[PDB]
Each structure stands twice: as C-alpha cells, then as structure tokens.
Design a protein around this ligand. Structure first.
Ligand SMILES: *[C@@H]1O[C@H](CO)[C@@H](O[C@@H]2O[C@H](CO)[C@@H](O[C@@H]3O[C@H](CO[C@H]4O[C@H](CO[C@H]5O[C@H](CO)[C@@H](O)[C@H](O)[C@@H]5O[C@H]5O[C@H](CO)[C@@H](O)[C@H](O)[C@@H]5O)[C@@H](O)[C@H](O[C@H]5O[C@H](CO)[C@@H](O)[C@H](O)[C@@H]5O)[C@@H]4O)[C@@H](O)[C@H](O[C@H]4O[C@H](CO)[C@@H](O)[C@H](O)[C@@H]4O[C@H]4O[C@H](CO)[C@@H](O)[C@H](O)[C@@H]4O)[C@@H]3O)[C@H](O)[C@H]2NC(C)=O)[C@H](O)[C@H]1NC(C)=O
Ligand SMILES: O[C@@H]1[C@@H](O)[C@H](O[C@@H]2CO[C@@H](O[C@@H]3CO[C@@H](O[C@@H]4CO[C@@H](O[C@@H]5CO[C@@H](O)[C@H](O)[C@H]5O)[C@H](O)[C@H]4O)[C@H](O)[C@H]3O)[C@H](O)[C@H]2O)OC[C@H]1O
Ligand SMILES: O[C@@H]1[C@@H](O)[C@H](O[C@@H]2CO[C@@H](O[C@@H]3CO[C@@H](O[C@@H]4CO[C@@H](O)[C@H](O)[C@H]4O)[C@H](O)[C@H]3O)[C@H](O)[C@H]2O)OC[C@H]1O
Length: 453
C-alpha cells in the first residue's frame, strides 16, 4: 500500500490545541437546556473519550452595561466618574454563563487553557462613551478624552476579571484586550492601531507582573479578522515582543495560508461558515459548511499558516447557520453535533496540547498527511483521503531510537457514516496497517511501550 514514514528528527511548531467560544450569551443558551442537554453539549465539546476533546476555551471579557439582547455584561458596568477613582466591581458570579462552561471544561474534562479576550473596554473608558460602534480607549496616543486617561484603569480592570476567575477556581492562561481592532461594528468593538496596541501592552504587562494573580496570564494580540491584517500589525508589536507571548488572528478577511514573521506562537482564534445554511454533513460536494471542508481548513492553517491552535467561532448555539458546530433546539432541549464538530475533534482528540508537528513522507496524490509527536511520545498521523478506500502503512523512520518505536497502535476515522469511530490498526513489528476510508479524515496513533510491561 502507501507507506507514511514519520521523521521525529524534523520538527516544526508546537500545537497548543483546538477549541471554540460560548461568548455573546451562547453559554446562556447552553445553560437554558435541561440538565441532560447541558451535559450532552459539554460532553460533545470537551470529552477526551467520547466527544471532540477540545483543549482550549475562548471567553469574552464582557464590556456591556447590561445583558440586553446577547450582550456580555461587564464586571464594572457603572462608571466611577474619573479614572482617579477606584473602579466599581459588580461581580454576578456568572460572567454571562462562561464561568460555568469554564468550570466544567477545567474540572470535569481536564481543559488547562482558558483564553479571555475583551472585544471592548467599558463605554465610560472610551472616546465614544459606548462599548459598541468602535471608539478607542481614552488616553492612548490620538485618543485624549475630557473624562481623563483610562489606560491604567483598563489594565486594572482586565487584571480584576482574571482575579474573579481565579477566586472561582479557574485559571485564565491567556489574556487579550482587543478583538478585530481594524473593525467598527454595531456590537462590542474598539479601534486600536498596531502602535496603540503596543502602547497598551507596555501598560498591561507591568500591571499583570505586579498583581496578586496566582498565575500571570500570557498577553495576546490582536484578534484581527484575518492573517494579512494581523501580519500587518507585527512591525509595531515587535518593540514589545518581550511583554506579550501570543499572536491571534481569525480566518475571515484572509486565510491562514502563510507563516507570520513573529517569534510567538500564532493561534487561529475564530473561523466559521457564518452565512451558510445549516448542514450536519461530512461531505456533499466540498461546500463551505461541510465537515470535510473544515478538516481541510484546520490542515491548511497548521501546515501552511504555521498555526499552533485552531478555534471555531462558536461551539453550541441555536440558529440555522454554520456559525457554530453544535445545534441547540431551545424548545425541544436537543443537542445535535455537526460533522464540523467531529472534524475539529478528529484533530483535537489525538493532537494534544504540547504536541510537536513533525515531518511525514510517502503520501500518494489523494492523501494529505501531517504528523504530531505528543508530549507522552505517542505519534498521531493525520490522513485526509479525497479518494476511495486506501490501504496505508504508518511507521517511524528507521533512524528512530528503538524505544521511540510503537509497541501498539490505534486508528479512528470520521466520514459520512463515522464520528471519530475506531477502525482496525493491524500492528506488526512497529508498522500500523490501516484501511483509510473513502473521503475521510483518519488519525493513526503509534504508542510507545512507556512504563507498561
Ligand atoms: C512557526 O511558528 C513557530 C512558533 O509557534 C516559530 O517558532 C519560533 O521561531 C523563532 C525563530 O527561530 C524562535 O526564536 C528564538 O527564540 C529563542 C528563545 O526561545 C526560548 O524562549 C521563548 C520565549 O520564552 C518566553 O515565552 C514563553 C511562552 O510565553 C514562556 O514559557 C517563557 O517563560 C518566556 O516567557 C518569559 O519571557 C517573556 C519575554 O520573551 C516574558 O514576556 C515573560 O513574562 C517571561 O519572562 C520560548 O517561546 C521558546 O520556547 C520554544 O523552545 C522551547 C525549547 O526548545 C520549547 O520547549 C518550546 O515549546 C518552544 O518551542 C524558548 O524557550 C531565542 O534565543 C532565539 O534567539 C537566538 O537566535 C537568533 C537567530 O535565530 C539570534 O539572532 C539571537 O541573537 C539569539 O542568539 C542566541 O542564541 C543562539 C542559539 O542559536 C546563539 O547562536 C547566539 O550566540 C545567541 O546567544 C530566537 O529568538 C522562537 O522561540 C520560536 N517560538 C516558539 C514558540 O517556539 C517558527 O519560526 C514558525 N515557522 C516559520 C517557518 O515561520
Ligand atoms: O450575534 C453576534 C454575532 O453574529 C457576532 O459575530 C460576528 C459576525 O461578523 C463577523 O465578522 C464578519 C467576518 O466576515 C466578514 O466577511 C469577509 C470580509 O472579507 C472578505 O475578503 C475580502 C475580499 O476582497 C479582498 O479584496 C479583501 O482583501 C478581502 O479582505 C471575505 O470574503 C468575507 O468573508 C464580514 O465582513 C464580517 O462582518 C465577526 O467575526 C463575528 O464575531 O458577534 C457578535 C454577536 O452579538
Ligand atoms: O472498542 C471500543 C471502542 O469502539 C470505543 O471507541 C469510542 C466510541 O465512542 C466514540 O465517541 C462517540 C462519538 O460519536 C458520538 O455520537 C455521534 C453524535 O453525533 C452524531 O451526528 C453521530 O451520528 C453520532 O455517531 C458518541 O456519543 C460518542 O460516544 C469514541 O470517539 C471512540 O474512541 O472505545 C471503547 C472501546 O472499548
């Protein structure tokens, strides 16, 4: 058959993981399900045995004065009048039901990475006095406000949000202070130039470092709406590379098809078929909503975009578009995962946080392949097959040390009839032999002996 040979001596980027968000009250929609539906939604998103095993949760740091519409209410919704006055914290113990999703992800399912990102400062900290319709943080260069300089106040505010999570037994590991800073919208939005982002990082970094936080989160920037627009910000950010540790961008205004010039890991923190009519299918024709298409979008972001993480926009939500991976029927209390959920899971279940991408060779024309060395020494080989059933052999390069060689192997596939379903991995003297199904994403995992006799 086709032999795929993994070269552990040729390494690329680290994989931090895969995930999604329940921002803008999508967590509230989950919380309104019956207890059984709540558990099924959480299981399909986070279960490492029977769901997508998503390893990252991205939360919104609420900017709004109330929970009107789908707004995320701020921890400090009321202005103290002046930035000289202590901020007025009005904690609701909920954070728009994201705290509950976070507590389940961490304490029930073992998630260790929690990315909190503000779309806006509270309106009283901004040039336009509103968390929506753009505007800029008061006190930045070119944004001097009558009300005063709110830059330190915003840093104190973000630090306090992380502290409220910490006191609710969730560690925020990564912290963002803008989203789509090039875009004014009718919802939470805030305009920063790349130079303004650098200016604010110089204020936020020492604020975090001097804080009483148990774990100092890594600062991220800037959740631009595409690879091209985020890459355009890196020049101005380069003066503060010592003060942040994560580059973030979405896949809307351009695709993650090149490696950004930055020393930091790069995360693709939001993508979706936002406009597309709901489909649950894995493959119909390669349309924008199909699970097959999304398995390939992840492949492209990692292999071509040099991404260390991949987050779909929303996990579970109501509504009839492909903005989300898991459909909620609010009336019926039902939860239906799309094959986009299983696409991301077919990655996330087997490519665990800290995995190192490694070279794999031997792919025929209908196969696209990638390989990952997990921290535990298990080697996950991704095979995306556009053709018919394909007989594949999976092995390490002969130069591998004998104790890196597998003692066992398993395989799982997702396709039109399978959701991360185990398939036969016949194992002979270090070689896994697998029938990769037609139009599937198959992951073959080679397991060393480790401490087992
Ligand atoms: C695809 O994406 C990849 C990223 O996902 C990308 O990889 C990046 O490649 C660049 C280019 O090669 C690498 O840049 C080098 O980095 C070396 C330092 O690396 C170590 O430190 C990094 C930063 O660590 C901070 O951040 C971490 C996470 O936030 C924390 O865990 C740390 O605690 C630390 O935080 C602290 O510091 C912060 C300030 O930085 C601060 O805010 C914070 O509060 C805190 O105080 C780590 O990320 C990095 O980790 C990697 O490697 C380790 C070890 O293997 C792995 O375990 C990790 O998993 C991870 O992969 C390291 O710990 C620099 O030393 C190096 O500079 C030297 O070489 C250049 C030329 O290339 C010289 O110009 C320069 O002068 C330096 O010279 C010195 O050393 C050389 C040795 O060759 C020597 O010859 C010379 O004489 C001199 O003494 C360079 O900058 C970058 O690290 C990669 N990032 C990552 C994440 O791996 C890749 O390029 C992309 N691919 C493509 C094709 O684009
Ligand atoms: O309920 C609310 C949620 O809906 C909400 O979600 C936000 C919805 O809007 C999202 O932003 C959209 C992202 O997609 C963009 O369309 C892109 C635009 O760029 C095009 O590419 C260009 C093509 O032409 C070239 O010359 C040019 O260089 C390219 O850039 C691309 O083809 C389109 O797909 C929309 O314009 C955005 O509106 C946003 O990310 C979501 O967060 O959140 C709030 C909640 O209340
Ligand atoms: O030998 C046993 C193995 O077979 C078993 O493998 C696991 C079996 O469960 C797998 O997780 C599945 C994933 O699919 C879920 O159901 C889907 C829900 O969405 C629908 O669209 C779709 O049609 C359904 O199939 C299911 O709830 C969940 O359990 C898991 O990935 C396999 O590893 O492990 C135990 C062995 O003893």
């Amino acid at each position: 058959g086709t032999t795929l040979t993994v070269d552990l001596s040729t390494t690329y980027q680290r994989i931090d993981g895969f995930g999604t968000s329940e921002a803008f009250q999508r967590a509230v929609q989950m919380s309104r399900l019956p207890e059984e539906g709540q558990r099924r939604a959480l299981d399909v998103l986070f279960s490492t045995t029977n769901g997508a095993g998503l390893s990252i949760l991205r939360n919104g740091i609420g900017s709004s004065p109330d929970m009107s519409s789908d707004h995320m209410v701020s921890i400090a919704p009321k202005s103290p009048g002046s930035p000289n006055n202590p901020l007025i914290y009005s904690w609701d113990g909920s954070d728009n039901k994201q705290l509950w999703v976070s507590q389940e992800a961490v304490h029930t399912y073992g998630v260790k990475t929690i990315y909190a990102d503000a779309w806006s400062a509270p309106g009283y900290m901004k040039t336009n006095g509103n968390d929506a319709n753009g505007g800029t943080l008061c006190g930045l260069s070119g944004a001097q406000c009558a009300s005063g300089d709110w830059r330190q106040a915003y840093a104190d505010y973000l630090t306090k949000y992380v502290e409220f999570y910490q006191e609710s037994n969730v560690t925020v590991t990564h912290l963002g202070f803008i989203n789509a800073p090039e875009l004014t919208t009718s919802y939470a939005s805030m305009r920063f130039s790349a130079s303004q982002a650098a200016e604010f990082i110089r204020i936020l970094y020492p604020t975090i470092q001097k804080s009483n936080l148990t774990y100092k989160p890594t600062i991220a920037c800037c959740d631009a709406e595409g690879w091209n627009s985020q890459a355009g910000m890196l020049g101005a950010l380069s003066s503060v590379n010592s003060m942040f540790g994560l580059v973030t961008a979405h896949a809307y205004t351009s695709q993650p098809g090149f490696s950004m010039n930055t020393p930091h890991p790069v995360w693709m923190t939001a993508a979706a078929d936002l406009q597309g009519a709901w489909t649950s299918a894995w493959y119909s024709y390669g349309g924008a909503g199909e699970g097959w298409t999304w398995a390939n979008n992840v492949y492209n972001a990692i292999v071509n975009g040099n991404a260390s993480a991949y987050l779909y926009w929303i996990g579970a939500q109501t509504g009839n578009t492909n903005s989300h991976m898991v459909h909620i029927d609010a009336n019926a209390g039902t939860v239906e995962p799309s094959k986009r959920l299983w696409a991301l899971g077919q990655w996330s279940r087997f490519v665990r946080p800290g995995a190192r991408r490694v070279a794999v060779s031997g792919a025929s024309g209908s196969l696209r392949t990638a390989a990952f060395r997990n921290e535990d020494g298990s080697v996950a080989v991704v095979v995306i097959n556009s053709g018919g059933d394909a007989a594949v052999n999976v092995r390490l390069a002969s130069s591998s040390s004998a104790d890196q060689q597998p003692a066992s192997a398993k395989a799982w596939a997702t396709d039109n009839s399978r959701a991360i379903e185990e398939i036969q991995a016949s194992f002979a003297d270090g070689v896994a032999t697998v029938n990769v199904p037609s139009r599937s994403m198959t992951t073959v995992v080679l397991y060393p002996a480790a401490d087992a006799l």
